[PDB]
Amino acid sequence: SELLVNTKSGKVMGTRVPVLSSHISAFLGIPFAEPPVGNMRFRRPEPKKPWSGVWNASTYPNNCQQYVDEQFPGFSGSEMWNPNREMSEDCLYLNIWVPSPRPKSTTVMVWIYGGGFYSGSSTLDVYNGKYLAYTEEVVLVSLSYRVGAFGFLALHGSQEAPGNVGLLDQRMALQWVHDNIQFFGGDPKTVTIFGESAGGASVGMHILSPGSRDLFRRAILQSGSPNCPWASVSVAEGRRRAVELGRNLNCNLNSDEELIHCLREKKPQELIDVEWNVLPFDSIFRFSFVPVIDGEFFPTSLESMLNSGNFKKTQILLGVNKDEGSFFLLYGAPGFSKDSESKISREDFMSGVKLSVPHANDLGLDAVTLQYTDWMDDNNGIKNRDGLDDIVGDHNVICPLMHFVNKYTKFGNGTYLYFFNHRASNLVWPEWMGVIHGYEIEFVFGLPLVKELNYTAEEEALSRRIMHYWATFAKTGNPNEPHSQESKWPLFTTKEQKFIDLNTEPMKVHQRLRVQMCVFWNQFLPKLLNAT
Amino acid sequence: SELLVNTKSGKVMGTRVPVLSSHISAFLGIPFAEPPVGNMRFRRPEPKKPWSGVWNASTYPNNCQQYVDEQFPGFSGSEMWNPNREMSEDCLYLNIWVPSPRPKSTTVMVWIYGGGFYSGSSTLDVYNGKYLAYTEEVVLVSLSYRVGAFGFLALHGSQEAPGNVGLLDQRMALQWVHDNIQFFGGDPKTVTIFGESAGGASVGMHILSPGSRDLFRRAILQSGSPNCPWASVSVAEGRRRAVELGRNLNCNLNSDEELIHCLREKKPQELIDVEWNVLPFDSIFRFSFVPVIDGEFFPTSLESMLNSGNFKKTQILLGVNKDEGSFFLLYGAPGFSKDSESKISREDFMSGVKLSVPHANDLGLDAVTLQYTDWMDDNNGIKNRDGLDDIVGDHNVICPLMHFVNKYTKFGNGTYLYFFNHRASNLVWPEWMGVIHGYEIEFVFGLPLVKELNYTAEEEALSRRIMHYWATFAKTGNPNEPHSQESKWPLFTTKEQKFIDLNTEPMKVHQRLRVQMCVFWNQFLPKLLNAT
Ligand SMILES: *[C@@H]1O[C@H](CO)[C@@H](O[C@@H]2O[C@H](CO)[C@@H](O)[C@H](O)[C@H]2NC(C)=O)[C@H](O)[C@H]1NC(C)=O
Ligand SMILES: *[C@@H]1O[C@H](CO)[C@@H](O[C@@H]2O[C@H](CO)[C@@H](O)[C@H](O)[C@H]2NC(C)=O)[C@H](O)[C@H]1NC(C)=O
Ligand SMILES: *[C@@H]1O[C@H](CO[C@@H]2O[C@@H](C)[C@@H](O)[C@@H](O)[C@@H]2O)[C@@H](O)[C@H](O)[C@H]1NC(C)=O
Ligand SMILES: *[C@@H]1O[C@H](CO[C@@H]2O[C@@H](C)[C@@H](O)[C@@H](O)[C@@H]2O)[C@@H](O)[C@H](O)[C@H]1NC(C)=O
Ligand SMILES: *[C@@H]1O[C@H](CO)[C@@H](O)[C@H](O)[C@H]1NC(C)=O
Ligand SMILES: *[C@@H]1O[C@H](CO)[C@@H](O)[C@H](O)[C@H]1NC(C)=O
Ligand SMILES: CCOCCOCCOCCO
Ligand SMILES: CCOCCOCCOCCO
Ligand SMILES: [Ca+2]
Ligand SMILES: [Ca+2]
Ligand SMILES: [Zn+2]
Ligand SMILES: [Zn+2]
């Protein structure tokens, strides 16, 4: 029967689950690597030893060890992103949704969760693959990978903690999908990877990494790209942070070997409790243990790779949300509140600017301030609030993605760019936060098709629209229906740089996404910081 | 009779001249200093030795030696600013218009012509004082002063070419008005000095200079202020330029004495023909021989004087025109033409930016470019043209004047600020040049009251309006009529920074004149240049 499947690594048994009046198969918690436990903590992943007997794939796996967000307890807006399973270093598992009856050889989509490389789970309600597998006839996979120090502690030159092992976890899952997804009705030649925030950066990083390029066909990046200022560190800075982690836990620092031994003997929670102390600056939108520019996973610097065309050349679909910064301001900048309009005083604006651009010298902070201050109205608290939102959004997400899309399009085989600006009717966050980082994911996964979630009819329509864009792009490399009366989503080209609004209104075409501010962030400010 | 007047220096005979259906007395060409000729070239002025007999004051005097503008020969737009008398080093004379019958003790206004401190004449048609003396019952004086190297060659430390002698020429005329204007029906206690461009900067410089403050009551500055980037140089830079002038003329440079002797033996025209070669940069809105920050005429730096309140505290009225830059672009920047719309290419925009901010390093040029480029539309030739106009206008006139007005208002006794934006119906320059530097002067002097000049009725109305503002301010320190139904021109205050439009439409009140761009020019760019 469908629910019993054999794989090169063992037999797997899944469950028939309901979805929207019908049913499909789910294979939850399939292992793709050895448990990275004990002396394998921080090591590259090794492949899952094949198993005798049937592997029960009926329930979601454990989540990886991570910092848990408790700033707003008992509030669904935050807790929807927390782990909803027990946390464990034994966490390298993947989930597969397969339509019923099983397809012969159909399109595969692999989801890479975000969470700043320090958090995330494949098991979140919002990542439930069944609505997408069902409505669009695709084999939907969600993988997992180690986060925080467990996935990204980087002592470049050591073999026991080399960095990027979290990215290697993702590759090994991609490898396992590669060798085994046929058995589930999946076409290994038509794998689309997609992911949001750190998951979107991860996708770009597999586009760049030679060791990953053969494992998928095309890619979707949502509010994330590999060159984001928070998504990687130098080898030197990763070493600095790893040593500082040990220093925080009273470790022998005389040598990599002693440092790593100490860190391997600490309980997971003792590492998590000091994770944030290794950051060089007071900041927002900065995370301690992230990918490292090592010379192996990334042969050279990201910019040099992007300039020379040293990356997988294929089709990409990608975009951003309208209010990317507001989440991080609420959590980390003075004057913001979940319980008020968060009018920001001039004094708090200045504090926010420094937290948002922590690497900038004072001349750089003045440049940011002048670029974003309305000097006809410098005490308007709402303009200051919105200005910080744009600063955080532009610097951390939108302008790096625009730099990636312009560099990629010179060599790629087709680009589609969106600007998601629909605020869900049922959003639990306050209105000033707008179209929040992460809140397009629920439309991509079909959650508005469920009536118990009380979205509006227009919102269900937009979800079906988005899902059909995403799925058609995965199958054909083009999100547009082949010969439709519906408005086409135009290719983004070097010359005209078109993109679409994704919202409930009829699709509109625009050009040069926030081009003025991204010249500031991508050309001028870096030039000013290199000189001063 | 009126036309015969005695003065502490000699007797003076004037002419009865017609003006608008009536008549007034004119006293043209009264000398206030010894001819600064021969060995007195470059020396401070000495007062005019009193004379026996009647001085014929019937005709305009000679004009000072100056560079003559011949870039558009036989074109009234340019030739209206050229000397209209014979040029001579014997040029320190003043003119007086006195109403008929002679007033007992009425308000005096003294005009200081502009021309970049390298040109100008009291005798230009457009400076004809009769329409203002007549229509507003004031004793109108126009003075003169040495320009170019003759007025501003600066070898700080020498007594034979110390710098600022052109400004000393102006003071001595102010002194002569001070001791002698009673005899013409003038109240020496109620002298308003006023002036445009370099004349406006000159006014501010007498406001600042201790040796000048007692010689007038209040002041009007038109499109000029003492801190303009072109209106002064350091002692070191003035010395550099003086030596380079000698170098251009093959002089002994071993010593100030030898250098000055050589320069004193050259014909005026040999100095004029190399005047522009001493500029350190290819540039526009930069002039070779200007006031020097010497420690005597100016006790300390202008900024330190402005910060500490070390200046004459009284009432000031001042303002700018809408399109200050276009004159200098037409003459000196690539792509501009008197015979076309002057759409400016990206390549020519970049050249223009460097000519306009010649002291800026490359990072500074990028900052200017980014501040003034519309990156949604960077190839729009009209936007580039208008952007250069704003760059030249903001950097050279408007933002320095806004810095002066904000600094002055902290200590002064009342400020009135205008924004002149009427384009005369009969302007001979092309339309893209807009409201040109210098073209409010004809309204201040009443030229639209003459019907042979074919201004419109509204333009005559605006001229009478402006003349009554200027004259009432000179008499009372306030341009508003004491108890009128007419809209008041509000005081400019530190807190609300109000100003008015001066045009044919009903007066409008605005606040914070070009505040966004002047933060760039007055705070950020100087900070960037000091760091890099
Ligand atoms: C993506 O690559 C394909 C294949 O190289 C491109 O298609 C070819 O385009 C050339 C030039 O237009 C034609 O001469 C060939 O006949 C095409 N081949 C096929 C199989 O279609 C395609 O244009 C590329 N698309 C983008 C957006 O770069
Ligand atoms: C200009 O100076 C005058 C004189 O110092 C100011 O007038 C005085 O203002 C104070 C405070 O308002 C009053 O107590 C006096 O009675 C005023 N004296 C006279 C003679 O009027 C005047 O306010 C100043 N104006 C500005 C704009 O600074
Ligand atoms: C497969 O698993 C089903 C549900 O399993 C549950 O999770 C595991 C980890 C245990 O905690 C167990 O007690 C739970 O019920 C079972 O209902 C099902 O019978 C299992 N299938 C087989 C063949 O054992
Ligand atoms: C005063 O001057 C009047 C006009 O003078 C003219 O200018 C001078 C410089 C000479 O060039 C002269 O030839 C011109 O006529 C005379 O018309 C008038 O008579 C003069 N008055 C006296 C008392 O001499
Ligand atoms: C709306 O959805 C919530 C769960 O998100 C559910 O509890 C509620 O009952 C729904 N609305 C109504 C009217 O029932
Ligand atoms: C307009 O003024 C000019 C001089 O500026 C004059 O020559 C002309 O005759 C005037 N207009 C008419 C219609 O005469
Ligand atoms: C000191 C701990 O700081 C935690 C900062 O959290 C950053 C992420 O905030 C947004 C979470 O969805
Ligand atoms: C090399 C000579 O350059 C002359 C520049 O003239 C600058 C002033 O132009 C505007 C004249 O009204
Ligand atoms: Ca926003
Ligand atoms: Ca203009
Ligand atoms: Zn041990
Ligand atoms: Zn000699």
Numbering used by the authors:
A (entry chain A), B (entry chain A): 4 to 535
The study reports:
Stabilization of Torpedo californica acetylcholinesterase by the divalent cations Ca+2, Mg+2, and Mn+2 was investigated. All three substantially protect the enzyme from thermal inactivation. Differential scanning calorimetry showed a single irreversible thermal transition. All three cations raise both the temperature of the transition and the activation energy, with the transition becoming more cooperative.
